[PDB]
Each structure stands twice: as structure tokens, then as C-alpha cells.
Scaffold this active site. Structure first.
Site, mmCIF file in Angstrom:
data_model
loop_
_atom_site.group_PDB
_atom_site.id
_atom_site.type_symbol
_atom_site.label_atom_id
_atom_site.label_comp_id
_atom_site.label_asym_id
_atom_site.label_seq_id
_atom_site.Cartn_x
_atom_site.Cartn_y
_atom_site.Cartn_z
ATOM 1 N N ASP A 19 0.832 -1.208 0.000
ATOM 2 C CA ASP A 19 0.000 0.000 0.000
ATOM 3 C C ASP A 19 0.858 1.247 0.000
ATOM 4 O O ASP A 19 0.499 2.250 0.589
ATOM 5 C CB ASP A 19 -0.938 0.004 1.214
ATOM 6 C CG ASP A 19 -2.094 0.970 1.091
ATOM 7 O OD1 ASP A 19 -2.471 1.370 -0.021
ATOM 8 O OD2 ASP A 19 -2.665 1.313 2.176
ATOM 9 N N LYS B 64 2.458 3.261 -5.988
ATOM 10 C CA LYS B 64 1.980 2.134 -6.761
ATOM 11 C C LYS B 64 3.039 1.601 -7.743
ATOM 12 O O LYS B 64 2.975 0.423 -8.112
ATOM 13 C CB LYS B 64 0.638 2.477 -7.422
ATOM 14 C CG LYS B 64 -0.463 3.019 -6.458
ATOM 15 C CD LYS B 64 -0.617 2.257 -5.112
ATOM 16 C CE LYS B 64 -1.261 3.101 -4.026
ATOM 17 N NZ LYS B 64 -1.024 2.483 -2.636
ATOM 18 N N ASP C 154 -3.485 -3.106 -2.098
ATOM 19 C CA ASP C 154 -4.525 -2.059 -2.168
ATOM 20 C C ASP C 154 -4.467 -1.317 -3.507
ATOM 21 O O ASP C 154 -3.420 -1.263 -4.164
ATOM 22 C CB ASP C 154 -4.343 -1.052 -1.015
ATOM 23 C CG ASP C 154 -5.571 -0.161 -0.818
ATOM 24 O OD1 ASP C 154 -6.675 -0.574 -1.221
ATOM 25 O OD2 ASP C 154 -5.439 0.969 -0.260
ATOM 26 N N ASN C 155 -5.576 -0.683 -3.873
ATOM 27 C CA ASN C 155 -5.608 0.318 -4.942
ATOM 28 C C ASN C 155 -5.288 -0.246 -6.312
ATOM 29 O O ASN C 155 -4.659 0.422 -7.146
ATOM 30 C CB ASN C 155 -4.635 1.460 -4.636
ATOM 31 C CG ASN C 155 -4.889 2.112 -3.322
ATOM 32 O OD1 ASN C 155 -4.022 2.101 -2.433
ATOM 33 N ND2 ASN C 155 -6.077 2.682 -3.163
ATOM 34 N N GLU D 196 -11.483 4.425 -0.397
ATOM 35 C CA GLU D 196 -11.775 4.875 0.940
ATOM 36 C C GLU D 196 -12.580 6.167 0.945
ATOM 37 O O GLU D 196 -12.227 7.146 0.284
ATOM 38 C CB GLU D 196 -10.479 5.035 1.737
ATOM 39 C CG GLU D 196 -9.403 5.873 1.055
ATOM 40 C CD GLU D 196 -8.355 5.046 0.336
ATOM 41 O OE1 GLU D 196 -8.673 3.960 -0.201
ATOM 42 O OE2 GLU D 196 -7.174 5.512 0.273
#
Ligand SMILES: Nc1ncnc2c1ncn2[C@@H]1O[C@H](CSCC[C@H](N)C(=O)O)[C@@H](O)[C@H]1O
Ligand SMILES: Cn1cc(-c2ccccc2)cc(O)c1=O
Ligand SMILES: [Cl-]
Ligand SMILES: [Mg+2]
Length: 213
Positions: free
Chosen positions: A139, A142, A167-168, A197
């Protein structure tokens, strides 16, 4: 002050010391009502919780701590004696994360290291006495998900069954990592669709279980 300092102060003034759930709730309230921030949040956090409970990892590595939300989220579900190591390149954020963990009462379970993942990962075996990791939460920025995954393998830190949870993978997205793990016979992948989020924007987590030799 900074947004991150405001989040910490809000927690200290709106949660109960030693009560991780109250800490999470305070952060989520602040970020929904006052100022958005890039914590994994409650929607994706519930998926994380379900994964943590499934695997009961003894040793978790987190890449990217920020204010400590996800560290609190994971560490509160760890069994006695289990441990989380989290890496955070920004020293102001590392300091906030330590204070957040202290407030939550989780400081004995978590070690927050202030440095870049690519520099700290090669030190885990010799300096930190790590053998292999049970789970990794990716996280951080990226563009580092893929290189750090490859580095973890190079360094001997993955075992059969190590769970990578990223994540993401939709927003901001991590296209090279996602293509790589989904195309590799050394990972078994599952996508968990969710929401960014605090927002009505689709996002998701990818679980990639290492199979390799
Ligand atoms: N190479 C790197 N190593 C360690 N931390 C990094 C990094 N690149 C970026 N970061 C950190 O990654 C964080 C991304 S936000 C992390 C949010 C957190 N996991 C939570 O859900 O609560 C930032 O604080 C950033 O400073
Ligand atoms: C690092 N990072 C960034 C974002 C984000 C930033 C700006 C617009 C949209 C998303 C969300 C995250 O969960 C995260 O870990
Ligand atoms: Cl949320
Ligand atoms: Mg994130």
C-alpha cells in the site's frame, strides 16, 4: 499543522486509549466528515479483516504506513505473539504512526521502520531475524508494488502460501503489478472489488498467493 497531525489529534481526543476499534472509528469519521485521507478505510478494511482472520498470519509486512490506520486494523486481529513490521519512507508519518499505535495499545505487536522499502527489505533476514513472511500488505507508491514483490522473492522472504494483499489495484491502479501476478504461474490471484476509501468510486484489492519454488 498538517492533515496527518490533525488526524492523530482527532484520534487522541475522540477515541479510547487501548481500544483499537475506537481508533479506527475516529479516523474513519474524521476522514468522512472533515478531510479525506488515503487510509485503506472501512470498506476495503472489512475485506482485509476477513483475509487476516482466514490466514491468522504470524508475521505480516506492511509497505506504506502513513498514519497507522492499516497497521492498527491488522494488528488488532493478530493472535498473541504474532507480529507486524511496517515500513514508511516519510519520517513525519513514521512518527505519527508510532503515536497512533501507542494510543491504540498495539505498540508491542508492531514495529514501524522509517526508511524506503527497497532499502529495508534486503535487511530483514540479517538485521531483523526474519525467515519468511506469512502475509504482505502492499500500500505504498503504486510503482513499487512490482519491484518490491520481485525483491521479496530475490531475498528469500516468500514461502509457498505467502499472501500478498495489494490495495488500490483500480484507483490509482498498479497495472504492471496486476498484469504480472495475474499472468504468473507462481501466483494464485483473487480480486476483491470494493470502493476507494470514503468515496463512491470503485476500487479493489488483489490477493496474490505465492506458489513458486
Ligand atoms: N518505497 C517506500 N517505502 C516505504 N514507504 C513508502 C514508499 N513509497 C511511499 N511510501 C509511503 O506509502 C504511504 C502510502 S499511504 C499508506 C496508507 C496506509 N497503509 C493505511 O491504509 O493506513 C505513504 O505514507 C508514503 O510515504
Ligand atoms: C497511495 N494512495 C493513494 C491514493 C489516492 C490518492 C489520490 C487520489 C486517489 C487515490 C489512495 C490510496 O489508498 C493510496 O494508498
Ligand atoms: Cl470507507
Ligand atoms: Mg491505499
Amino acid at each position: 499543522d498538517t492533515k496527518e497531525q490533525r488526524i492523530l489529534r482527532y484520534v487522541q481526543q475522540n477515541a479510547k486509549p487501548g481500544d483499537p476499534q475506537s481508533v479506527l472509528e475516529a479516523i474513519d469519521t474524521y476522514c468522512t466528515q472533515k478531510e479525506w485521507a488515503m487510509n485503506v478505510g472501512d470498506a476495503k478494511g472489512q475485506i482485509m479483516d476477513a483475509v487476516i482472520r482466514e490466514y491468522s498470519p504470524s508475521l505480516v509486512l506492511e509497505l506504506g504506513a502513513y498514519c497507522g490506520y492499516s497497521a492498527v486494523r491488522m494488528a488488532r486481529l493478530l493472535q498473541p505473539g504474532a507480529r507486524l513490521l511496517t515500513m514508511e519512507i516519510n519520517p513525519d508519518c513514521a512518527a505519527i504512526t508510532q503515536q497512533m499505535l501507542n494510543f491504540a495499545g498495539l505498540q508491542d505487536k508492531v514495529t514501524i521502520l522509517n526508511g524506503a522499502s527497497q532499502d529495508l527489505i534486503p535487511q530483514l533476514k540479517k538485521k531483523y531475524d526474519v525467515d519468511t513472511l506469512d502475509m504482505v500488505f502492499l500500500d505504498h507508491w503504486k510503482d513499487r508494488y512490482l519491484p518490491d514483490t520481485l525483491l521479496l522473492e530475490k531475498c528469500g522472504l516468500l514461502r509457498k502460501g505467502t499472501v500478498l494483499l495489494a490495495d488500490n489495484v483500480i484507483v490509482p491502479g498498479t497495472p504492471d503489478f496486476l498484469a504480472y501476478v495475474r499472468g504468473s504461474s507462481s501466483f494464485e490471484c483473487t480480486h476483491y472489488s470494493s470502493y476507494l476509501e470514503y468515496m463512491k468510486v470503485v476500487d479493489g484489492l488483489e490477493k496474490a498467493i505465492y506458489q513458486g519454488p
